[PDB]
Structures are given as structure tokens and as C-alpha cells.
Amino acid sequence: MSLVYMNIMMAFTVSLTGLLMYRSHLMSSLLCLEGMMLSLFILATLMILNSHFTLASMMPIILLVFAACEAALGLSLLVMVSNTYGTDYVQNLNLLQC
Amino acid sequence: LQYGPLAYILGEKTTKKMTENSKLITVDGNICSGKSKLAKEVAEKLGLKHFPEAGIHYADSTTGDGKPLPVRFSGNCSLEKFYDDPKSNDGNSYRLQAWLYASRLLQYADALEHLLSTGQGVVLERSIYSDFVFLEAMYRQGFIRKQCVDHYNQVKKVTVCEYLPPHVVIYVDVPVSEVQSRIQKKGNPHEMKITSAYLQDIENVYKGTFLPEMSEKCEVLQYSAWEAEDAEKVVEDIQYLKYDKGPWLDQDDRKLHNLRMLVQDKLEVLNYTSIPVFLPEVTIGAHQSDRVFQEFTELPGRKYRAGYNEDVGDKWIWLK
Amino acid sequence: LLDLIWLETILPKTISLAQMKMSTTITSQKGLIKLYFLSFLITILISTTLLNFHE
Amino acid sequence: ARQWQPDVEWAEQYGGAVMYPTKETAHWKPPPWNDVDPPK
Amino acid sequence: KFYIQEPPHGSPNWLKVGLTLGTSAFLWIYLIKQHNEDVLEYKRRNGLE
Amino acid sequence: MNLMITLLTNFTLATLLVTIAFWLPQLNVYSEKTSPYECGFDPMGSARLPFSMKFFLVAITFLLFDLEIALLLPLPWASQTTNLNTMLTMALLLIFLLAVSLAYEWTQKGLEWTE
Amino acid sequence: MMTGRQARAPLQFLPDEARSLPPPKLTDPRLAYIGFLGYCSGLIDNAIRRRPVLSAGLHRQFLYITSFVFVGYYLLKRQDYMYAVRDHDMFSYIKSHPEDFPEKDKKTYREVFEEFHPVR
Amino acid sequence: MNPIILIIILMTVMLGTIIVMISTHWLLIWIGFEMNMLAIIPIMMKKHNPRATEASTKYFLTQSTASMLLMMAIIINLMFSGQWTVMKLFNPMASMLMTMALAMKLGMAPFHFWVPEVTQGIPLSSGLILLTWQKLAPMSVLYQILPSINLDLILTLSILSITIGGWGGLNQTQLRKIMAYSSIAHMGWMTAVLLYNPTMTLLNLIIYIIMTSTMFTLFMANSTTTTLSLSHTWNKAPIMTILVLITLLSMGGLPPLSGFMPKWMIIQEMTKNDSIILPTLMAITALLNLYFYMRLTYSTALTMFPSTNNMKMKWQFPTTKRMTLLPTMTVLSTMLLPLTPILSILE
Amino acid sequence: MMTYIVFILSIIFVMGFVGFSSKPSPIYGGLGLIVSGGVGCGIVLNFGGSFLGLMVFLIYLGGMMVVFGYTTAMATEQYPEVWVSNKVVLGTFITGLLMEFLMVYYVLKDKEVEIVFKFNGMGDWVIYDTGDSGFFSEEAMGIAALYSYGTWLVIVTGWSLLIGVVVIMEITRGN
Ligand SMILES: CCCCCCCCCCCCCCCCCC(=O)OC[C@H](COP(=O)(O)OCCN)OC(=O)CCCCCCCCCCCCCCCCC
Ligand SMILES: Nc1ncnc2c1ncn2[C@@H]1O[C@H](COP(=O)(O)O)[C@@H](O)[C@H]1O
């Protein structure tokens, strides 16, 4: 297939491995979920604008909506981690190991 | 049942009946402080409901026919044998203290249930916030062990965190010599075996640990012995209080609804009094527990649920 | 020797110790998000490169 | 002469954070009873 | 009078007893009507009369 | 094409007002003039400490209400449709759901700041 | 397996052709076992709430029995329908494909040679 | 929580599962999963303690990663098929990514690393919602894409789930982690029979949901969250020990109980397809699940662990709890095996 | 090399993704994600989606301003890692960049490449339509159809945003 899908899928995989390998800091990986949403947006939108399947043009908007509709969720779940502990480090969330 | 989330949805908000008469007042003091009439006197001035101090048989007084059950079914302990042999081998001291803490937890649940269901305030005597002073006096006198104090602290840590403090705590300064004089004038031969150091430790855990930590979350009213004889002065001091401290001010309908759904379920109130901490004072073994449980089932009015007993005269069981 | 030790050794006790040992290795996790998702990445890389489940 | 029923020594085997305590699973205290932690 | 407090199940909840017996009688008469309609429809679709 | 030329020109003579702002005057560097500013006195602690946000629930709800102007924005184009009562119903449904959201955030004191 | 059958008529618990089948009797032992499950549910319900197990709540036990018999009647109807569909599709597929199902010529045991294996 | 808000949030969890079940479009599947996760996060944080916040953070990260992989599988399907219909997938890469996404959403091993953590952190009611209602939408999507699921992948996930969920529960004394490793092993059983007969997948799902709802309702009715607190039940309500006995012996796959019903039928559908080794290893590995079930029955029903003195107060108070459908679910989880050919209604 | 403009913007997209995916600090994570979301609205704007690129630019600008406020309020340390402070940040940053320009070099020299899929190496101008859409940009018509045709999508999206507000206010309470 076309050349740009290589790099947009590459950016998805880069953001995937960035999300899936934590650096002990939860906000730095909540950016990686938002980057995966960006890469899925641009990939789906290139496919939809390419093929002129115009009725799915409303699809990435909807996709983008649920992007922040979980990203806000993560931030609402970031502040409860950072109120229990002074930092949002992910290694403070190990109480459920026993 | 009678109360639930559906009653809360259909309009029964529990601050629609929360008036200025709805005050939970706990009267405290030493062993013979003379508070025993004083609380009732407050309950005949402010129009409140007096609860007596939870003995061993408070749960017996709330369930069944209200009569006290035999002590092998409730307590498995004796206050008089604690007065006779405090350092006993069978561990009667902490077993009595744990049963009294569970009874006061039940009484405080009954108090909050009355306060949140009817809007009438309750006058208690030695609630669960003041129960630890007898534990600490018993531990300073060497009556119990440190593992008993750790068991009490675990049970208190997981039970008292779900409740609110009282609005008013009334404390009665009576010195140790006057307590001993009132014990000698009382006439109870077991109660006259209370040592002076135990009374002094009760007064020390009162004045040093209880009141300095309760003065922030409620309003203390510390009286002497002669001015607690006049209830009109005490009730006049209650009626002109400026209720500003404590977590009762930031209570909406939702928090008091959650509290009322906790409070009316008595097995959830008493859920953590029987935690599986195997302590030799309170752990009853398997065969004794089986024997006393099967003897408890054979009591009149105790074999089934509270409306399903033919031996006490419950009718229409086949339609219930 | 046989019917208290060795016939007791071969079938039931070795199987019991093996399931105990595997149970303690499975449940010895340190409760960390970092290690769990790094294991997820290694799973994805083994599925693609090593096992070819995308074929 | 009567039926054996378990004692404290038998029943405390089931009270740890795990069932088979190894070197790694040795510092694991059991979780709190109401599952509520001090705010630290 | 035995119990010191009036229990929740001292008297039968006659609204709930009436709902229980009415629901059960309705389900039985609807089941028997459905079964008679089903055997009549079987005998009609197969001519087994 | 012309857009990238215009942005290149704007970025170029915005960064060439900087390279003649650093390299034209005479520099006198000593390690007290480049210190941070705390009204003359030395700053107590770093400014990389956590500066606690009081408006955090409003900041998270801004993420949700900013999506609404990705949904309410095609209305000048949605008004051009030939199923128009349905469009009008769905548009008023979206603004009404935003308004129900704002009313819920009001009455549960979510718009107020903490402390 | 039969998912493409119930795709032209979706979400039909009992279709129209299910009325061409005999319904279960009300004395069906499967239905009597489901009614026994209702009675056992009534007994467990009186047991866990510490009611007298046989005497208390006869209306409640009777609605347990009635509700299980009522649900189980339609469950047995749908069961018998789906097995009749299974057999109908089996027989129609065997009939429409004769080359896949040849008529076997069952030889008698005077021509069939079996190796004798002596137990000695 | 305000009960109107609790009703709306639970109806939104149900709405997300229904939107996954009824929709023919991939974007609506993804919307249903997003709505399901988004609404179930405050059910986990109903109590507001650090363990619920940790469980909700781990659950959000796992389910968000799974939904990312799901939407990437959807977009690769859009490339290689030009369409959005919820049916088989037209690329093995999208098939692998969607199978990984659904295996993460089920908590199947080796993506199982969140189910004991999240299940222990949250209450018993929200743990019931997690282990039953959240196993309905990914099983819908797996039921719908089985012409494209890789055989080796779903069987590796299945037997790895059965083995890891067997070994995990042996080292547990917490009841929620026991039910979570039980969940892992049972999802392995459901997905192993997925490509052979998905009616048996639905049968195992329904019988599992009945037995798990029975066990969590018994735990809530007894207010027990550990093994050693479940062991006091004989001194308080001895019928509950009988119910957990019959339900735990049912969950182990012992005849004549209904939990033997799915397992046997799964074996009955895997030997038809000339697979003999794999259901044999699955059956033998289910003995580990049976072993920690038998451990719980020893501690609860078959022996009498020593109780405390304060239990004597709880003799005087009955249960005012809503034990909703507990006798019905207890009868259905134990005495349903003579009605085994009822599974044809799931065709 | 001007026909490769969408490819060049896509290289800058992957460079921004290696920039914030190495996770230096969410200040610079927000920087890299703004750079990627700003060249990604230049990738997709050259396909005809001028509405649908400006929105992923604008929504993510609001998003990274919010994320900035939180990483200055919650996710803050005394010495934030810029791009090079940690060896594990710089190592994987250089690794992602070298592997990205490696697959640039293998796709311009060979004009075909294969990582899992097969990809062309010609400029992606080749696949565009040779026709005109008249007096409507078709992506604007399709997003306008969210009100006429997308009624169920409106209902589930507006309900999800409503309960998103309700869910977030139920989480961020503490009691
Ligand atoms: C192939 C697709 C098949 C689809 C079938 C769909 C059938 C219906 C849905 C079944 C799915 C699981 C349902 C249970 C989800 C959990 C519900 C829940 O948690 O409800 C909350 C409530 C809590 O009780 P409470 O004590 O008040 O709480 C204290 C504070 N939390 O109450 C509880 O926790 C108590 C439990 C209530 C619900 C249990 C009964 C329903 C499920 C059991 C099977 C019933 C038989 C019919 C259906 C068969 C199929 C499942
Ligand atoms: N926790 C406790 N431990 C021991 N004795 C107690 C405890 N609480 C109350 N008492 C006794 O209860 C009596 C209360 O005195 P009165 O003021 O007459 O009610 C005294 O005998 C106290 O010693």
C-alpha cells in the first residue's frame, strides 16, 4: 500500500511501545494513549479521505471525541493517584500485590 | 424492609427532619461520677431519648423479649469477676472489654438510627469514643496484654472510622477520693475491690488522651461534681452552644443516607468485631462454640427470625 | 520403603511439590504496572516475530 | 476420643497474605479488614 | 406479646401476599391457556383431530 | 504552497529578531544577574515544586466541553440538509445535553474551586 | 452451528414453525424436575432467611414453583424446536446430497472375515 | 454514591454492553466498549480508598490499551475490506490485534495480570460486575469474528489461561483473588471451545455467570472477603456453609452438579474435531481449580474453625441484606445437570 | 521532492512520536505531541480534510494545555528530563530516530518495503482522485451528515459525554 501508511502505522507502534513500557511516571504514558488516538485518527482519516467514503468522514470526529472522553477519565484518575501520594509515580500503585 | 435507596429517591431526605433539637449528646465521667441520673435529667429537659449505658446485656435488651439472656449466650464474661480477679487466667478482662465495645458499637448504631430516622437527639452514656479509656486503664494496671490492646486498636480502627462523633460531650470531674466514697456508699461488694490506681488511670486517660482529641471534633462541657447536680445549668449551657466544630456541619443528604444504610444493618455494624485475630482471651474453640450456638437456637423466640416462632405465639406464618 | 516413602514419592508428592512450586512462581508478582505492560509488549513481540500469529 | 476440629495452629495457616510463603512472598502483610489504608 | 420491638414480619404484608397469589394464579391460567392453544394449533396444523 | 511560504517568512523574521537581539548588544555575564527573581531576595526552593491546581475539575471538564465544538461545529453545514427536522432535533439534543452537563456540574459544586 | 438458520428471523424465541411441533405436556418429567427446582428454591429461600423451611411462606414457595414451571415450559418448547430444526436440516442435507451418502451394502457374517484372537 | 447517579451509571454499563451486542458497525462496538469502561470506573471507586484507586488505574490502563488495539484492528479491517460490518475480519493482522484486544478485555493469560489486582481492590459487588457483566461484550465480539480467529492463538490463550488460572488460586487466601484466578481458568475453558462449537462457549459463559454470581452473593450475604473470615460462617449462618459447599463443589466440575455440564460438553465438542490431547490437558489442569475450591470447602463447611466471642452478639441479629436471587442461583448452579440438553436453546 | 510532501510531514510526525514516546517529561511530551498533531493536520489536510485536520489540531491544543496544567500541578519533579538528561530517554530517542530514518533509507532506495504489510516507496500523490467534487467538499458533507444520518451516533456520543462529566465528578470526590 501507499507510503504514508507506513509512517502512520510506525507512529502507532512507537506510541504503543511508549505506552507499553512505563518510565515510572503516569502522565508521560497518558500522553502515549493520546498519541495512539492521534495516530488512529490520522490513519483512519487518510483511509476515509482517500477512498471518498464520505459518510465515514464523521467517524474520526467521533473517534477523537472518545479520545478525550477517556483522556479526561485518565486525568480524573491521575489526580486521585496524586492526592493519595505526592507524585503520580506508577510504582506507588503496588498495594494490590499481596 | 422499611428504608433503602428507593425511599431516598422518593423524597425522604434525612436533613428535612434534622432540626436544632437533633443533638447526639454523650455524658462521660469516672465509675461513680453521678452521671447516671444526669444524662436522664438532660433527657427530661431537652426532650431527648436517653439510652442507658451498655452493659453486657444491651443486645439482649434490644432483641427478643428484651430480657437478659444467660451470660454464656451473651458476653461469656462477668464484670464482677473482673472486679474480683482482674489478672485472671481465663482472660475475662479483655473478653469483657471486647464485649462491652461491641455493645457500645451496637448502642451507638441504635443512637444514630434514632437520630437519623426520627430526628430526635439521643443522650448516651460512655459511647465508643470513650470506651478506650477503660482498655488503657486495664493495660496500665497490667490486667491485659499488649496483644489485647492491638486487637482492640484494630477493631476500633476498622469500626469507628465509619461513624460521626457526638455533637456534645459532657464530662464530670469527680476526684478519686470522691469516687471511692461513692463506691463505699454504693454497697456493691464487688465494686469496692476497685483499686485506686485503676481509677487514677481512668481519670488520666480521660484528661490526657480522650478530651484533648475530642475537643476538636465536638464540644466538651467539663463540669465538677457539685455543678453536675443541677441539670438546669448544664442544659442552659447546652442550649447556648455555637455548633461549629466537627464533621457534622459538612453532612448532606447523601452522606447521612449512606450512614443510615450502614447503621440500620446490625450485622454490618458488628461485622468487624469478630475479625479472625486468634487471641486467647476472645477466641472460643470449635466444640464450645457449636455447643453454645445449638443451645442458643433452642431458646424461646430465638430459633427463627423475629416473626416466625410458634413457641412464643406468632400467627400467620404460612403467609409470611 | 515402598508404600510409605517411594510409592508415596513418585505419584502424589512430586506432583504436589510441582504444583506448589508453579503456584508460588505465578503469584510472586510485585504488583507493578510497569512490569505487567512490559510483559504485554514481550507477548506481542513473541506473537509477531516468534510465533507468527499475524499470518 | 471426640472428633478433631481445627485449632489456632491449624487455622493460622490460612491467615497470611499468601498460602505458600516463599522468600519473595514473606514481607507481604495481609490486607486491612475494611480494605482502607492509612492516608500516609 | 413477646417481642420487645415490633418486628418487620410481625404481620403478613397483605399487599405482597395478594400480589404473590395474583401473580401465581395469573401465570397458571396463562400457562394452561397457552398449552391449550398450542395443542389446538398442533392438531390444526397436522389435522390430528 | 503559499501558506508554507508565509509561515516560513513569519518564523524567519520572528527568529531573526531574536538572533539580532542576543548577538548585537554587549554581553556582561556574571552569576548574580542571571539568578531568578524573588523581588530581590533569593528564592526559597525551586519553582519546579508541584503548584497545586485548584481549578482541576473545571480543567478536566474543559476537555469534554471542547469536544462539543467538534460536534456542534458542522451546524452551518448541517443546516443545508434535506432531512432538516431530524437535524434540528439532533442539534438541540446536543446543546441540551451540554446544558444538562453544565447544570449537573453547577449544582454538584463542580465549578467552584477547592480550598 | 445453526446460527445461519436463525438469521433471516432474528430474536424469535419461538418461530411460527415451532407451532407445527407438539408442545411439552404439563406432566413432562423435565417440567416436573423444573418445578422441583422451584420448590427447592423456595426451601433454600426459607432456609437462608431463617424461616421455618416447610411451613413459612407457602405463597412464596408456590410462586417459586409457578415461576419455574412457567419459564421451563417455554424453555422446553425452544429446546424441542431446536432439536427438530437440527433433524430437519440433517435429513434435508442428506436428501439433497445423495453422492455424499452412499447406500451401504451390509454384508452378512458369512462373507465378513474377522480375525479370531484367542484368550488362552 | 447518590443512588440516582448509581442507577444512571449502572444503566450506562448495561448500555455499553448492549451497544456491543446489538450493533452491526465496528465503530459502535468500540463506542460500546468505551462507554462500558467509562461508566464502570466509578463503580470500582465506590468506596474511595487507595486500593480502589489503584485497581481503577490498572483497569483503565489495561482496558484503554485493549481499546487502542481494537480500534487499530478496526482500521486495518477498514483498509483491507473498505467496510465496517461486524463479521469476520479480512486480514490476519487485524485478526491478531482484535484477538489480543479481546483477550486483554477478558483478562485471559498472559494478559491476566490485572484481574486478581483489580478484583481484590474493589468491593464484592463491583467485583461481581467485573467478573460477570464485563465478560459479555468481548465474548460477543469473539462470537462474531470466529471465521477469522487464528486457531493457534485462541488455543494458546485458552490453555495458558487454564494453566495460569489453575496455579494462581492455589497460593491465595483472599476470596476475590480466588474468584479472579477462577475467572481466568474459566475464560480459558470458554475460548478453547470457541472455534469448535460457540454454543458451548455461550453455555460455559452462562453456567459460569450463574456460579460466580452465586459465590459473590454468598460472600456479600456473609460479609466475608478472606478465607479465614468465611471460615466463621458455621457459627453464624450454617446454611450458608452448605450453599458454599455445593457451589464450590459445582465450580470444580464435579458430577452430578451443573458445573460439570460445560466442561464435559466442551470435551464433547473437542473430541469430535479429533483433538484428544488438548481437552485432556484442560480437564487434568482443572483439578487445580478443584483443589483450591476444596480448600475453601474444608475451611468453611467440612470442618469448624475456631470462632470468637463477639459472634455471640451476631446470633441475635438476622440478615437484613438483599440476597437477590440467591436461592434461585444456588439451585441453578447445583441441580441443573439433568437439564443438560437445554443448551440447544443457545444455538 | 515536493511531491513527497505528505511523506516528509509524516517523517516529522514519526519524529514527534519518538519525541514524546521516549517520555522525557510531560512538558516535552506535550511539546512533541503538539508538533506531531500539528504536522498531522498537514498530512491529512493534503488529502482534502481541511475541516478534519484543523479539529485534530485544535482539540489537541486544548488537550495539551490541560495536560500542561496537570504536569505542572501533579506530574512535576525538581529536575525535569529535557530530552537528554536520562540515558534511557536519549538512548531510545536515538534508537527510534535511527530506525525511522533506516526505514526511510530502505524505502527510497528500493521503492518498496515490507514491515508487516508491504508498502510502496513512490510519493503518495499517486493515489489521489483525478476528478472534482463540484460545489461541495465531500468530507464537510460527511461530517454534516452526523445530524441527518448519524442520529444514533449523536445519542450515544452525547450520552457518553454527559456521563463522562458525571463519572469524572464522581471520581474526583474522595468521599
Ligand atoms: C450469552 C449472553 C447471556 C446474557 C444473559 C443476561 C442475563 C442477565 C445478566 C447476567 C449477568 C450478570 C448479572 C449480575 C451483575 C452484577 C449485579 C450487581 O452487582 O448488582 C449489585 C447488587 C449489590 O447488592 P448489595 O448487597 O445491595 O450491595 C451492597 C453495596 N454494593 O446485587 C448483587 O450484586 C447481587 C446479584 C444480583 C444479580 C444476580 C442475578 C442475575 C445473574 C444470575 C443468573 C440468573 C438466571 C437468569 C439469567 C441466566 C444467564 C446469566
Ligand atoms: N469498658 C469497661 N470495662 C470495665 N468496666 C466498665 C467498662 N465500662 C463501664 N464499666 C463499669 O460500668 C459501671 C458504670 O458505672 P455507673 O456510673 O454506675 O453506670 C462501673 O462499674 C464501671 O467500672
PDB file of N, CA and C and ligand atoms in Angstrom, chain B residues 30-36 53-54 79 82-83 96-97 100-101 104 125-126 131 134-135 138 186 191 194 198 202, ligand 2:
ATOM      1  N   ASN B  30     -16.150   9.247  85.445  1.00  0.00           N
ATOM      2  CA  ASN B  30     -15.480   8.114  86.072  1.00  0.00           C
ATOM      3  C   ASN B  30     -16.545   7.105  86.522  1.00  0.00           C
ATOM      4  N   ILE B  31     -16.164   6.130  87.354  1.00  0.00           N
ATOM      5  CA  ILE B  31     -17.009   4.964  87.615  1.00  0.00           C
ATOM      6  C   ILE B  31     -18.258   5.334  88.414  1.00  0.00           C
ATOM      7  N   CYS B  32     -18.131   6.227  89.386  1.00  0.00           N
ATOM      8  CA  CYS B  32     -19.289   6.677  90.151  1.00  0.00           C
ATOM      9  C   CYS B  32     -19.397   8.191  90.122  1.00  0.00           C
ATOM     10  N   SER B  33     -19.341   8.767  88.920  1.00  0.00           N
ATOM     11  CA  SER B  33     -19.404  10.216  88.765  1.00  0.00           C
ATOM     12  C   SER B  33     -20.781  10.807  89.039  1.00  0.00           C
ATOM     13  N   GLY B  34     -21.816   9.991  89.205  1.00  0.00           N
ATOM     14  CA  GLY B  34     -23.146  10.538  89.365  1.00  0.00           C
ATOM     15  C   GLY B  34     -23.756  11.043  88.083  1.00  0.00           C
ATOM     16  N   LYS B  35     -23.256  10.582  86.945  1.00  0.00           N
ATOM     17  CA  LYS B  35     -23.745  10.988  85.639  1.00  0.00           C
ATOM     18  C   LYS B  35     -24.994  10.209  85.253  1.00  0.00           C
ATOM     19  N   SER B  36     -25.232   9.119  85.978  1.00  0.00           N
ATOM     20  CA  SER B  36     -26.239   8.121  85.645  1.00  0.00           C
ATOM     21  C   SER B  36     -27.655   8.670  85.716  1.00  0.00           C
ATOM     22  N   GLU B  53     -26.419   3.064  79.826  1.00  0.00           N
ATOM     23  CA  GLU B  53     -25.080   2.613  79.480  1.00  0.00           C
ATOM     24  C   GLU B  53     -25.106   1.134  79.123  1.00  0.00           C
ATOM     25  N   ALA B  54     -24.459   0.788  78.012  1.00  0.00           N
ATOM     26  CA  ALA B  54     -24.454  -0.582  77.513  1.00  0.00           C
ATOM     27  C   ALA B  54     -23.676  -1.474  78.465  1.00  0.00           C
ATOM     28  N   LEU B  79     -18.567  -8.734  84.854  1.00  0.00           N
ATOM     29  CA  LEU B  79     -17.927  -7.552  85.415  1.00  0.00           C
ATOM     30  C   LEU B  79     -17.490  -7.793  86.850  1.00  0.00           C
ATOM     31  N   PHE B  82     -14.323  -9.674  86.935  1.00  0.00           N
ATOM     32  CA  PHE B  82     -13.265  -8.717  86.644  1.00  0.00           C
ATOM     33  C   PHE B  82     -12.909  -7.896  87.874  1.00  0.00           C
ATOM     34  N   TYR B  83     -13.907  -7.547  88.684  1.00  0.00           N
ATOM     35  CA  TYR B  83     -13.633  -6.823  89.921  1.00  0.00           C
ATOM     36  C   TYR B  83     -12.952  -7.707  90.951  1.00  0.00           C
ATOM     37  N   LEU B  96     -14.374  -9.261  78.500  1.00  0.00           N
ATOM     38  CA  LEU B  96     -15.371  -8.297  78.953  1.00  0.00           C
ATOM     39  C   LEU B  96     -15.234  -6.969  78.220  1.00  0.00           C
ATOM     40  N   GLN B  97     -14.001  -6.515  77.988  1.00  0.00           N
ATOM     41  CA  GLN B  97     -13.810  -5.228  77.323  1.00  0.00           C
ATOM     42  C   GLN B  97     -14.214  -5.283  75.852  1.00  0.00           C
ATOM     43  N   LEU B 100     -18.013  -5.383  75.747  1.00  0.00           N
ATOM     44  CA  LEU B 100     -18.556  -4.057  76.014  1.00  0.00           C
ATOM     45  C   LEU B 100     -18.322  -3.104  74.856  1.00  0.00           C
ATOM     46  N   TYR B 101     -17.206  -3.239  74.134  1.00  0.00           N
ATOM     47  CA  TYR B 101     -17.008  -2.394  72.962  1.00  0.00           C
ATOM     48  C   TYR B 101     -17.999  -2.734  71.860  1.00  0.00           C
ATOM     49  N   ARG B 104     -21.331  -1.244  72.965  1.00  0.00           N
ATOM     50  CA  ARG B 104     -21.392   0.199  72.774  1.00  0.00           C
ATOM     51  C   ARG B 104     -21.441   0.567  71.302  1.00  0.00           C
ATOM     52  N   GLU B 125     -24.450   7.363  77.316  1.00  0.00           N
ATOM     53  CA  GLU B 125     -23.532   7.347  78.446  1.00  0.00           C
ATOM     54  C   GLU B 125     -22.351   6.475  78.047  1.00  0.00           C
ATOM     55  N   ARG B 126     -21.175   7.096  77.903  1.00  0.00           N
ATOM     56  CA  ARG B 126     -19.915   6.439  77.543  1.00  0.00           C
ATOM     57  C   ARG B 126     -20.017   5.712  76.198  1.00  0.00           C
ATOM     58  N   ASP B 131     -14.750   4.544  75.110  1.00  0.00           N
ATOM     59  CA  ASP B 131     -14.599   3.184  75.602  1.00  0.00           C
ATOM     60  C   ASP B 131     -13.141   2.790  75.778  1.00  0.00           C
ATOM     61  N   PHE B 134     -11.047   2.691  79.450  1.00  0.00           N
ATOM     62  CA  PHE B 134     -11.039   1.538  80.333  1.00  0.00           C
ATOM     63  C   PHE B 134     -10.052   0.492  79.858  1.00  0.00           C
ATOM     64  N   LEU B 135      -9.897   0.352  78.538  1.00  0.00           N
ATOM     65  CA  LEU B 135      -8.856  -0.506  77.985  1.00  0.00           C
ATOM     66  C   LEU B 135      -7.478  -0.029  78.414  1.00  0.00           C
ATOM     67  N   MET B 138      -6.912  -0.630  82.132  1.00  0.00           N
ATOM     68  CA  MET B 138      -6.634  -2.047  82.340  1.00  0.00           C
ATOM     69  C   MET B 138      -5.244  -2.436  81.858  1.00  0.00           C
ATOM     70  N   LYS B 186     -22.090   3.042  97.848  1.00  0.00           N
ATOM     71  CA  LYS B 186     -22.924   2.313  96.897  1.00  0.00           C
ATOM     72  C   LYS B 186     -23.403   0.992  97.485  1.00  0.00           C
ATOM     73  N   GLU B 191     -17.744  -4.076  93.602  1.00  0.00           N
ATOM     74  CA  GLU B 191     -17.259  -2.786  93.131  1.00  0.00           C
ATOM     75  C   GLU B 191     -16.326  -2.120  94.138  1.00  0.00           C
ATOM     76  N   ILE B 194     -12.283  -2.258  93.585  1.00  0.00           N
ATOM     77  CA  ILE B 194     -11.583  -1.462  92.583  1.00  0.00           C
ATOM     78  C   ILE B 194     -10.431  -0.721  93.244  1.00  0.00           C
ATOM     79  N   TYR B 198      -6.400   2.089  89.406  1.00  0.00           N
ATOM     80  CA  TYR B 198      -7.270   1.897  88.250  1.00  0.00           C
ATOM     81  C   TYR B 198      -8.153   3.116  88.012  1.00  0.00           C
ATOM     82  N   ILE B 202      -8.042   5.696  84.840  1.00  0.00           N
ATOM     83  CA  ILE B 202      -9.230   6.119  84.094  1.00  0.00           C
ATOM     84  C   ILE B 202      -9.269   7.636  83.974  1.00  0.00           C
TER      85      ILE B 202
HETATM   86  N1  LIG J   2     -15.062  -0.871  79.369  1.00  0.00           N
HETATM   87  C1  LIG J   2     -15.323  -1.168  80.665  1.00  0.00           C
HETATM   88  N2  LIG J   2     -14.558  -2.044  81.352  1.00  0.00           N
HETATM   89  C2  LIG J   2     -14.815  -2.345  82.636  1.00  0.00           C
HETATM   90  N3  LIG J   2     -15.832  -1.817  83.336  1.00  0.00           N
HETATM   91  C3  LIG J   2     -16.678  -0.928  82.769  1.00  0.00           C
HETATM   92  C4  LIG J   2     -16.466  -0.544  81.368  1.00  0.00           C
HETATM   93  N4  LIG J   2     -17.433   0.340  81.061  1.00  0.00           N
HETATM   94  C5  LIG J   2     -18.199   0.509  82.168  1.00  0.00           C
HETATM   95  N5  LIG J   2     -17.746  -0.247  83.183  1.00  0.00           N
HETATM   96  C6  LIG J   2     -18.322  -0.321  84.524  1.00  0.00           C
HETATM   97  O1  LIG J   2     -19.676   0.076  84.449  1.00  0.00           O
HETATM   98  C7  LIG J   2     -20.042   0.795  85.658  1.00  0.00           C
HETATM   99  C8  LIG J   2     -20.552   2.163  85.282  1.00  0.00           C
HETATM  100  O2  LIG J   2     -20.873   2.939  86.429  1.00  0.00           O
HETATM  101  P1  LIG J   2     -22.255   3.722  86.522  1.00  0.00           P
HETATM  102  O3  LIG J   2     -21.841   5.172  86.527  1.00  0.00           O
HETATM  103  O4  LIG J   2     -22.857   3.222  87.811  1.00  0.00           O
HETATM  104  O5  LIG J   2     -23.009   3.300  85.287  1.00  0.00           O
HETATM  105  C9  LIG J   2     -18.800   0.794  86.541  1.00  0.00           C
HETATM  106  O6  LIG J   2     -18.839  -0.338  87.408  1.00  0.00           O
HETATM  107  C10 LIG J   2     -17.674   0.617  85.531  1.00  0.00           C
HETATM  108  O7  LIG J   2     -16.487   0.070  86.065  1.00  0.00           O
END
